[PDB]
Amino acid sequence: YYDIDDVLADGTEFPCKFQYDIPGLGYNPGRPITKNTKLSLPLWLARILAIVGPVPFVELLPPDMFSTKVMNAIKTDPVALDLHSINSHFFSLAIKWIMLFSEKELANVVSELLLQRAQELNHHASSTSTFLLKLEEMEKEIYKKSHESYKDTKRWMFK
Amino acid sequence: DDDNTEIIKSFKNFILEFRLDSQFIYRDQLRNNILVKNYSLTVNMEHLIGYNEDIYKKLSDEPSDIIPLFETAITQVAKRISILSRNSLPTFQLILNSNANQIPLRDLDSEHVSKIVRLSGIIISTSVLSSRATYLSIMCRNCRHTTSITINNFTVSLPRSCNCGPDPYIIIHESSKFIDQQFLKLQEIPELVPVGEMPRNLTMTCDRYLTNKVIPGTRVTIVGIYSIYNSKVAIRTPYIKILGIQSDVETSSIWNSVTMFTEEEEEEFLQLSRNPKLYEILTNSIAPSIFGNEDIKKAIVCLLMGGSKKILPDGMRLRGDINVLLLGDPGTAKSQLLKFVEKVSPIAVYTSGKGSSAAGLTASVQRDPMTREFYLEGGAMVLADGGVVCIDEFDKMRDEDRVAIHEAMEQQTISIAKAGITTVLNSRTSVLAAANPIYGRYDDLKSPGDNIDFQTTILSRFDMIFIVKDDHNEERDISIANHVINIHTGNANAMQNQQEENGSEISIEKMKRYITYCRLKCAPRLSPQAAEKLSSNFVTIRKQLLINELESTERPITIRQLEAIIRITESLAKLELSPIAQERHVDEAIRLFQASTMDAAS
Amino acid sequence: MYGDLGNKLVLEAKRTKQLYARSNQDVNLPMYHEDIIRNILKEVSNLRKNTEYLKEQQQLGMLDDKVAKCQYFVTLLCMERNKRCLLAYQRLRTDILDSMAWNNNGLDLMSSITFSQQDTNNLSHQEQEYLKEYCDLITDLKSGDLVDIDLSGSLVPPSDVFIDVRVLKDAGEIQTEYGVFNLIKDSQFFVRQSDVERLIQQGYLQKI
Amino acid sequence: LPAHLQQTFSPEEIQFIVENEPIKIFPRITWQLITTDDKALNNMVAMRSTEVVLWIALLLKQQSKCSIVAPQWLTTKELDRKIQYEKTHPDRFSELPWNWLVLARILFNKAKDDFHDPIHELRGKIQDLREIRQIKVLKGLKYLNESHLQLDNLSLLEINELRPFITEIMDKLREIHTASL
Amino acid sequence: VSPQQDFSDLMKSWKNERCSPELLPYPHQLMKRLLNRISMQSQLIENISMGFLDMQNESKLPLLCMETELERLKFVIRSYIRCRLSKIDKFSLYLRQLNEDENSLISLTDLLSKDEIKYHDTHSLIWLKLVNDSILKYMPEELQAINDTEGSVNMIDEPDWNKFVFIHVNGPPDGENEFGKPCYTVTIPDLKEEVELTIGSIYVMRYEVIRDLLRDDKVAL
């Protein structure tokens, strides 16, 4: 889409092995690659590669960032974990995998991640320290519109 | 204490009532910081003297007996601010600074003891974090009476009242609350007032949000209170408890670090990048003192920015930024120059050694003769990490860890396997070699090599090596000689640089903030073809110095020399604040080391 | 190695979004990358060159192979990919410039976009023609109203009503309109909000 | 293309909104003015209570040919009943004139002379009022969920200043949640 | 017809406008009488202003009061229109996606002002000039279209009726849709059940579920 982050979000590679042999290698001299050869792939191409085959072209193993490891890691103390370190595009992404793969539980978890995050993120409304570094890009911009709102507001409040 | 409670009301008044037109600055500051979890407030004593003189007159009198009271109210203030009731809320810290009036350290005796003293000095070494009590409670060893002590500041042994006796109480360690304490060892400023003697160090102590606020070895200002405690007649050890501490300009820096942001910087730093003269105007920042020597003058800049440092897996990592040689005849200005260079660095250590001033040039681990157990004592190179390396007398450097310089410059590290400790500790420090060459101009008609100790390899270890040759030549002098008498009185050249400040030139305390600024953004990099150009340039540098060596001349060149010139590219580029580097961009870095190639040809 | 090349470009698009975002706002777009998009273009033409070739090859020996069926469902994606990148790059590159139009012309008496938007040469000619054509279009919005608007002007609400503006090294006076207020270096006034709006954006007036 | 803000209103603007509200004044003066949205009036009785719009009163107060009445809601002893209601109702925000914060700054800037002892009093009471109200806001912010919001009594300044944060966020909430299906 | 109701609904339109999720109808039926009314006294005031030069061989207060009234009212419609022009640009494609379609309600004279449709297509057209001469040459065949593929996606966007916004409820009550407990209204959300509503209560939610109530003028924003 026309937000840079939308073409940028599919710039992430996901573990995927193909269910078929694929002559005309997309990458160098296969020319085919044998079925079930593991490869990290951009979501923009991969997203449909499941939708067409009724068995799909691609198997799509679970991503490294959605591991039980991380999924409960966030469940422990959401504020402390660094989202910038993980992707950094996550809410801009996890939304895409939860659409494409259509999961139901991790959602109810993830939403809460952003919730707690925002509970804190509002607390910076007042005029960082270590925190400002570790935010996701959308988590970084929410800060912009939110903060700058105040940043104008107080400047109005006095002269 | 209800007198103190009236004082409590007095400060609650002080906060709720006070106004700068119209917001109540401290009041805003509170709800601001409670979400920071700062739990502390910095109050101008002038808004205080402006609010009520009385409370200060008694505050300035025995502040020790009041400062906690001052807090007991503002910690209550948060109660009437943070939340509404009808948790747990930590007892506040307070940090007060004021313009005040500066006092020199050598004159501090008796008198002002147990009062406020603003003063600067400089910290030498940081003590390790030492945690101290905040709340503690105790059951009796005998009657099992449950005591609760709030330990407050600012010794005091545990109270014995419910055999029962003499004092049957041991801490409930499980339920207790705590705080850190720093124990600053800090030293008077280098300039005043040594008279003839040695600089004193007077010990002070941080706590809570004051801790780790100040780097070892940086210029700082502490206010605090002059006081004493026994610490094995009556002969008690002098010290100062700390409130509040403020960095001398900035110093901020640490860690990661600071801007913050004051937007005009980005623009003003970008306009610098849009100034074609900026590289060269940096060159004109470096020596208001030194007129001329523009070559090495361009050479200093590129170091400070930091060069390419790229970590590519596996653990292989190449250094930045590099090394430089000021070796040349006395009259080079290179010590005067270096005494510019270190003052330029945000963080660095000036070493004329041997090692400076008393420093083992490398950290020398030395046993605490009390309670045994070797501990690393720190080192000039160690403390200067991520900062400039200053060296004079490099003819004379310690030979054993001369090699630790032969190493730390390159591998960005020093390995100490000595005694117990095996830790390989970081010196990313970038060296500038200022030593005086053997016999001055006499190594010029000789083999210019082996000039440095007994091996030529040190040169390879260094990068930008520069031989400064001043013949007594006409008119290049008469203009700098003209420059001289202006420089001295009345600073007729130091006024002439202030209209270049308005016209062009940088302020250079700025230059700190510039180089601090663009060293924290990610490392710049060249496009491929300037590199291949380094390949056809150097294939002829190396070709040239085998052909130059057709005379069987001993020497000088390595493959770390080409790479050395590489790092100069990302240096001069990091000036630009550009992720890339242009062909010619790199090219004047080439012409910049090209004089050193003729240093090989001479 | 494939649709990646555009990602450098959209990354640059991120940074150049940041150069308008806080920013503080001086605008001044760095350049149109003519070289890199053409690298993309030689591969985007190469892609449909390969695909047109396969459209020949599918007709002969591939025989609508289920895999031969893939690369139309595959390479064309990167066509859409590039398109996304380029489009949004330019929609950025334009939205920023249309914004650069609206704010200032600019304002009286614009009277020209000349020297305004200092990029000039640096801004790619297709965008130069476009932009100037677009403010040609906005002049027609000055035609439609008949307010009078002063859409380009009067962005911020009025108050109240009189202010003191000081002139900065500006002469002047251009004040033939309304009445002649005699602009001199270090000259301030006491005047209503109305006349302010033009020379305050024209840079001549200052203090509010 | 407004760029800024853009969805939310600038406080600078919202003040222009509230400035359009009716209030009472005490005229010095005894054409028409015609205007548009004014109606009134014929030469308006001096030294008497009369209803007008704010901004006109602002300007004539700037000529001091009028005097603005303190709103009957704005008083010390009144602020007490409301803030007390505020402490004893940890969830509801009680009740307010709703343009008030703006009104406060507006009047204190100029109208300051007409009140009796607003100085060093109300600015504190409303600072604190805005305080406990602000924590009531911020504490209410943990119930934040899609899709329901009761802000009930909250001022347009109060709200608008924080608008981007709940709006923008809540979209990221609802979108993903219903997206689950 | 009340001149004050004109500006009341002018602000209603404006205030609703910037906060709005997406572009809504152009109130020409009332604005018209306005854009004329402004020039009415815009001309009148100068007659009594230069007529004030006739006494010159005192009361300027309502003079510049009246003057002020204009620029204060004239600025009003600016943000209103400009915002729409922006949302037009933002939606320029979708506007045509609804335009080429028969059903249901289109630009016509109905959604856009005459200047708005002119600006609309002139902008999208010149946009096409700029995009076509530069990145579509260079224009492989399936790529020759700027619109839905399908996926992803594009604009399309943004018929987002789902978005969150602040609102304030009001209507001239029968005391229609009022069910209690004190007050109206429903109706239940797409994935959830009823809340419901009262006028004194400001209830934030999806623009879809509440949209009719903007159309009904049952709630402020």
Ligand SMILES: Nc1ncnc2c1ncn2[C@@H]1O[C@H](COP(=O)(O)OP(=O)(O)NP(=O)(O)O)[C@@H](O)[C@H]1O
């Ligand atoms: N631009 C200049 N060039 C040369 N000399 C200068 C300059 N400006 C000042 N001087 C004077 O000349 C001296 C320059 O330093 P110099 O004689 O080279 O000693 P040095 O080499 O820097 N010290 P050392 O490292 O031990 O050899 C200073 O003592 C100044 O008094």
